[PDB]
């Protein structure tokens, strides 16, 4: 048997319903989502980190000339100058006065700290949604992970539940993301091969251990000071460090809908947007005959206490007269009031107490008891606390 | 190689029921467990009861509790025409012979023929799109799946348990007036029955005469085997104990190798204005696939075993086909 | 078993095994853009006119 239902996407708050066959006792269903995660299609593109100015020993030739040999290291710069008069601790390295030549060749290499400190680039799109559900259909309670796309049902006791796709394809992430130290930021980094000096992406590497890197640090060699063997070099500061000092606030606190971010793998969860539809396929063996369940007669409502707060604040005493003692489900067909419990145990000639939540000053709602209906009515009082520490359990009717 | 033979050295031979040993239902040491036929060139693997290779090429089989052996070149199997034995190790055999409907294997040690026939299909699979019945003398090379000739420790394993307490009506004998149980040399056994009260006794290489139960047909002396093992097969009872105690790996696992496959005759082509006619003279039934090089394929597939003439229309976008195992041929026309 | 995509696919795309992929079939047009440095250019007068 095919049944359709809808669920506002939000964890914690439970959901109660009864499927009512025209000639058999209603079958109860309870649903509780635990975690609703949303994982994107994310493909890694590159990685960056601190760089280190690789500088060999200066190549000095004394009264002669030299040439440049390109090692083809990334962003290599080579230069030769004349008219050098170097010194050493033990006097003069040379005796020549002029014609001396010195050659400098400089480059960049990845810092030793690349493994533990490195910012990753990511291209995100195509969010897929997963969920953990705690569902009980006909006192068959289960906790299970389910693919809530438009296929992939999960079956237990013959009951086949299918959670359809979301009504909204919104995602908190932008197309290009940057990851670092477990924090996530939506940033527009320049793409591979187009890095610029003094900004993010000056040094470029396909992977952590690619061993082939592109670089634009704009390294410039300079004439060393006279009477000293050394090589002065000038370059823009680390754009990674400039971005480190800039660091706009994190997505964990900037995202709308209050979406929390964890990255063991990149994912976002526990934030309410849209609705998830549920499709039940129930086998015909789970339906029980009416005579095998208690049936009531002359049942009446009374409203004992009212507080139309966020939490359940309506207490109702229902007085009944039963042919049998046995548990049955109680349901409110409309959204006027939402009950707290999925089932209530029932004596022969006792009275039942029911907790519910409503936002109506003058509620008048029809409850469905084991096989009959009763019409509870009354007025209700405002709350006392201005703010609470939990969300709303009910809807806001117009 | 003994490192791998010692695994199957210490298990057993065993006997089992047979549908036909040339005389009705029967009990034979030549029961066939199951047949698997997935190899391309017709290589088949058989799982018999008697084990092989234990000595270079010899068979060893049980007979009413006693072991015997025979050289391998005296046992023969067939489906429709005589088959051929390549190699045998442990419980398994590798054979090669064409398709059929049943597997019938037999031998003749004394002047009495032992046989079993079973209805398990064997299927000959042609490699490629050019079907045949016997691989050709010449052709081209392709990668198919054949069962490797080597016996090496792979990851595939089979299960093995302790033997059941098989009965033997021969041991119980009649004295002047009594029933005597005479276990063979150095073997243990267990005698059961209810002729008076209830009796379940054990014997360890001792002959026992029972004063009561002074007749033949009543009751039973089961054997005991401890240092030997059996395969988990439906034709043996399971003794007490749900233990498993070990498993063994299988030889002749499927492998990948180069494979000879036939080549079809070169088609005779005749051209026309946006049309091409094909003359075809297959030696054996062959496939044809033809498709256009446009967004609509209109793919057309045929099996042909007789000569015929087939005309096709080719547009500017292009035509393509394969006839048999030849490389694809693409034809592209122009304005004339 | 049905005919393969390498024998019935449109546009004659050839499919290989190791990465699931297709090659050598014509569809559409690739736009290309070039940023050429001035170093490779030559003066008109230095070329025959």
């Amino acid at each position: 048997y095919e049944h359709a239902t809808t669920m506002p996407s939000q964890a914690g708050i439970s959901y109660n319903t009864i499927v009512n066959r025209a000639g058999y006792a209603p079958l109860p269903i309870s649903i509780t989502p635990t975690k609703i995660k949303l994982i994107p299609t994310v493909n890694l593109e590159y990685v960056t980190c601190h760089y280190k100015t690789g500088m060999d020993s200066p190549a000095i030739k004394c009264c002669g000339s030299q040439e440049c040999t390109p090692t083809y290291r990334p962003d290599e710069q080579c230069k030769v100058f004349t008219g050098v008069y170097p010194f050493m601790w033990g006097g003069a390295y040379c005796f020549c006065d002029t014609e001396n030549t010195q050659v400098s060749k400089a480059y960049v290499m990845k810092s030793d700290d690349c493994l533990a400190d490195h910012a990753e680039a990511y291209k995100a799109h195509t969010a897929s949604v997963q969920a953990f559900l705690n569902i009980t259909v006909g006192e068959h309670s289960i906790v299970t992970t389910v693919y809530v796309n438009g296929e992939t049902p999960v079956n237990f006791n013959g009951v086949k539940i299918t959670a359809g796709p979301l009504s909204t394809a919104w995602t908190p992430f932008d197309r290009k993301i940057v990851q670092y130290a477990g924090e996530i930021y939506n940033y527009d980094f320049p793409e591979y091969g187009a890095g610029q000096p003094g900004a993010f992406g000056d040094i470029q590497s396909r992977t952590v251990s690619s061993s082939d890197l592109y670089a634009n640090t704009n390294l410039v060699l300079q004439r060393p000071k006279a009477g000293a063997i050394h090589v002065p070099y000038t370059q823009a500061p680390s754009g990674f460090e400039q971005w480190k000092k800039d660091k706009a606030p994190s997505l964990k606190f900037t995202a709308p809908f209050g979406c929390e971010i964890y990255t063991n793998p990149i994912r976002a969860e526990n934030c309410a947007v849209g609705s998830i539809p549920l499709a039940f396929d129930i086998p015909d063996a789970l339906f029980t005959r009416v005579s095998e369940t208690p049936t009531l007669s002359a049942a009446e409502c009374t409203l004992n206490e009212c507080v139309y707060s966020s939490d359940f604040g309506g207490i109702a005493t229902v007085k009944y007269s039963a042919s049998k003692s046995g548990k049955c489900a109680v349901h409110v067909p409309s959204g006027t009031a939402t009950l707290k419990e999925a089932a209530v145990e029932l004596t022969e000639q006792g009275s039942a107490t029911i907790h519910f939540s409503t936002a109506n000053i003058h509620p008048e709602f029809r409850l469905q008891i084991c096989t009959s209906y009763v019409t509870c009515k009354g007025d209700c009082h405002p709350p006392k606390d201005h703010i609470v520490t939990h969300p709303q359990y009910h809807a806001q009717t117009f | 190689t003994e490192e791998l033979f010692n695994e199957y050295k210490l298990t057993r031979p065993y006997m089992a029921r047979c549908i036909r040993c040339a005389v009705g239902s029967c009990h034979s040491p030549i029961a066939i467990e199951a047949v698997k036929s997935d190899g391309h060139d017709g290589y088949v693997r058989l799982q018999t009861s008697s084990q092989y290779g234990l000595k270079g090429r010899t068979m060893r089989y049980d007979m009413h509790g006693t072991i015997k052996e025979i050289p391998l070149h005296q046992v023969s199997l067939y489906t429709s025409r005589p088959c051929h034995i390549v190699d045998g190790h442990g419980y398994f055999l590798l054979a090669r012979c064409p398709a059929g409907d049943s597997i019938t294997m037999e031998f003749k040690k004394d002047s009495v023929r032992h046989s079993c026939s079973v209805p398990y299909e064997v299927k000959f699979n042609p490699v490629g799109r050019e079907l045949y019945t016997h691989p050709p003398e010449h052709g081209v090379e392709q990668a198919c799946q054949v069962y490797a000739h080597d016996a090496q420790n792979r990851g595939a394993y089979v299960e093995m348990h302790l033997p059941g307490s098989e009965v033997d009506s021969s041991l119980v004998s009649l004295s002047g007036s009594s029933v005597t149980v005479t276990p063979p040399d150095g073997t243990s056994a267990l005698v059961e029955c209810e002729c008076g009260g209830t009796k379940i006794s054990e014997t360890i290489n001792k002959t026992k005469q029972f004063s009561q139960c002074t007749k033949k047909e009543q009751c039973r002396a089961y054997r005991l085997q401890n240092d030997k093992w059996v395969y988990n097969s439906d034709k043996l009872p399971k003794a007490a104990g749900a233990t498993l105690k070990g498993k063994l790996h299988v030889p002749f696992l499927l492998a990948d190798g180069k494979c000879t496959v036939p080549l079809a005759p070169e088609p005779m082509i005749t051209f026309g204005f946006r049309s091409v006619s094909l003359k075809l003279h297959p030696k054996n039934p062959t496939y044809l696939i033809t498709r256009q090089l446009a967004d609509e394929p209109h793919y057309t597939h045929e099996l042909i075993s007789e000569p015929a003439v087939r005309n096709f229309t080719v547009t500017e976008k292009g035509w393509e086909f394969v006839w048999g195992n030849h490389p694809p041929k693409r034809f592209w026309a122009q304005e004339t | 078993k049905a005919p393969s995509l390498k024998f019935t696919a449109p546009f004659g795309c050839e499919i290989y095994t190791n990465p699931i992929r297709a090659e050598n079939c014509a569809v559409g047009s690739i736009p290309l853009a070039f940023d050429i440095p001035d170093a490779l250019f030559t003066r008109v007068s230095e070329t025959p006119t």
Partner: nanobody
Amino acid sequence: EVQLQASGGGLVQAGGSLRLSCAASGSIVSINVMAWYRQSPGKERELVAKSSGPFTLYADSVKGRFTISNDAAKNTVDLQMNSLKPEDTAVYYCNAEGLRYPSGTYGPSAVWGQGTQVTVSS
């Protein structure tokens, strides 16, 4: 992205015994297949070893001499290579197929490392 790193090889005399190792790095949790392929100069690519879980498979020209072991926990394969002949010189590549990304953005199926050179001297 997922990659394969190959280590081992070198120049040795005939009759020696070496080990070739290939390791997988990236966003992967389980691997269905890992195999070895050899490419000699002037010829085409051919398979040598074939390992996936407990099962193994060997070619015709490599039986009884080379052994393949796989560690899915480390996602590595070790080809213990013995009884060298002059025909064994080639560049060896390690391949991985049927990759199950840990959701794990689905991506390319197969990968190919740079490989290692093995040369044998008579």
